Amino acid sequence: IKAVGAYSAKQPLEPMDITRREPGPNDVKIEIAYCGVCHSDLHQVRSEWAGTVYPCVPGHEIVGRVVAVGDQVEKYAPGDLVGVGCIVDSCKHCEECEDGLENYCDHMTGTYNSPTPDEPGHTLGGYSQQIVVHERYVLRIRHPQEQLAAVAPLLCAGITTYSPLRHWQAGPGKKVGVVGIGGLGHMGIKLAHAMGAHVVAFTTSEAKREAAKALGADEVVNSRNADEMAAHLKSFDFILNTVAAPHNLDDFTTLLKRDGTMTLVGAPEVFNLIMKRRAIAGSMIGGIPETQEMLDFCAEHGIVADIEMIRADQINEAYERMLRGDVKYRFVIDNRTLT
Amino acid sequence: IKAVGAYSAKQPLEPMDITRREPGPNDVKIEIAYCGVCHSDLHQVRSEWAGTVYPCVPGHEIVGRVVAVGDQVEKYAPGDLVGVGCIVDSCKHCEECEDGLENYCDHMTGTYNSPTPDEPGHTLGGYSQQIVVHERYVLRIRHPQEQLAAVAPLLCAGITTYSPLRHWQAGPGKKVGVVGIGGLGHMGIKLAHAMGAHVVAFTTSEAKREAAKALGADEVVNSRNADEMAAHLKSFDFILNTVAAPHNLDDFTTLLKRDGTMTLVGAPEVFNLIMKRRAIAGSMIGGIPETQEMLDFCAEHGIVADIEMIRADQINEAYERMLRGDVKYRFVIDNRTLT
Ligand SMILES: [Zn+2]
Ligand SMILES: [Zn+2]
Ligand SMILES: [Zn+2]
Ligand SMILES: [Zn+2]
């Protein structure tokens, strides 16, 4: 099984062979077609303090076709179009898992870098030809097969924004802000718009103003222009901040209505929180049930990510561009190019 | 009408005569019996950036007896025991006011330092013999008259903690933390305990450990002892932080359960918010309806503040002690001493 991974934090991703466990009774064997490139992949293979275990094979925005299934699998059959996100296992018996929030389980097994009985001791991600996952964590893709690659980013970037939008009830009659026009930001705008909310996108440069409009934002604000920001004082029900290194959170807090919340999902003057009972929260990905709901919703609405397909040997160059925001708006690996 | 106030930020509080408007059709004329001393009073008369208008007459934890009422007043009659908090008026037609949240009204008139048609142009507080307030903002005291002085602090310190405890649903089956053992903290413990929650009080010194127990805390933690803090990891449903200058908010955030919130009411590693969908919020005082609910609740449960009665000419010395936390736990002025 071919894949692409790193041997150390300072070594660029390179070709390497890995192994996969034989499908167990509840397992689904998947032939990976495409894998989205997430900033978490970059961080994992480069960050010194990511607790990264090598070799490291990133990738967790996986879509492909079922090759085989265990004798106890009830959800899938060979030929099915499926997806895998950031979770491949969880304890299944804690309050979070029982509530369909496996993403918040204290013992959640991540698609990559988590301990597992499978060789070599830690999970290897989607930058590979195949993956074997317990059916509870495998999602069903309902989009037409021609859109598989564009569906890939939904498995992480998509759910990461979909989950909080749903949790804070974005929808008709709600004014929702989306900060950042990158991989996460573009999905936040697409989804908030599809949910029926009045969407305001925030950027730090005039260069991406038209781009935000094109994504579905009803209004766009350059957060560096005080006049533009002031026009939205105390008007937002919810603000989804997707910027990696969010700045001027004070400015955004003042844009929230009473009882409003700004949730951060990217990788604060108390006075402003107190005066209107506002809150700042965080959120990461989503549980499996909601990830499935999101995929169904996106399939019915024809929602997919805007992507740029690349070869498996171009991931290092892709990372460089991602750091400059030089992609519109998600890189997706054509896993067939592994061979 | 005698009172105590300041002429400048650097001038200690001193005796001064003030005037009150004649009771209008909806007004209640109150003979003030006692007035609690709040940190906001101190800040108002000393802070350079408090937008303070002089003369400044603080005080907004007022209790007294109705002397007269306008011909349109329907809630009160002469002889009634009443209270006044931080609010004396609001617009009455915005979403907040209509929801019983006059405290979050953008045009709320504070008991002191807010513009008003009444001479001298800004509101004068409870460090006086009498006050005239629109009946919508006057509360009814149901406690026995002998407890009037101890009821005074409920008008601000009380509602400031009662409101968020109710908003975040503190009660049986909930583990609630209260940070700080001062004026606000002691009320937070008393109220959280009365609401039926399992209460954990947090202090920064061993000196107040027994005091916290005495107030009703089921458990006490010295936040400076990592071992004590670690024993409560991811276990709180809600944490009410009452410390003026809260520190180590990161340590407290990690003590919150998934979807838990820590609300600040006193005068943060994003990672910890994201990993468990936690939030940090703010809250100030409470609307009138809830302030009344609180007073009724406290009357039925025999809840009052622990106070130290002082003369009106001892307020400056009181402030000094408050800054050192040298009071158990609220100073209350005997307004009769104004003469
Ligand atoms: Zn990701
Ligand atoms: Zn679990
Ligand atoms: Zn106060
Ligand atoms: Zn109002």
Describe this structure in words.
Chains A, B: Its EC number is 1.1.1.2. Chains A, B: Its cofactor is Zn(2+). Chains A, B: It catalyses: a primary alcohol + NADP(+) = an aldehyde + NADPH + H(+). Two copies of one chain form a homodimer. The first copy, chain A, has 339 residues and is α/β, with parallel strands linked by helices. Chain A has two domains: 190 residues, Quinone Oxidoreductase, Chain A, domain 1 (Alpha-Beta Complex); 149 residues, Rossmann fold. In chain A, 25% of the residues lie in helices and 25% in strands. The first copy, chain A, has eleven helices and 17 strands. In chain A, the strands form four sheets. In chain A, strands 3, 4, 5, 8, 9, 16 and 17 form a seven-stranded mixed beta sheet that branches. In chain A, helix 5 links the parallel strand 10 and strand 11. In chain A, helix 4 crosses helix 5. The N and C termini of chain A lie close together (10 Å). Chains A and B meet through strand 14, helix 9 and strand 15 of A and strand 14, helix 9 and strand 15 of B. The site of one zinc ion has 5 residues of chain A, from loops.
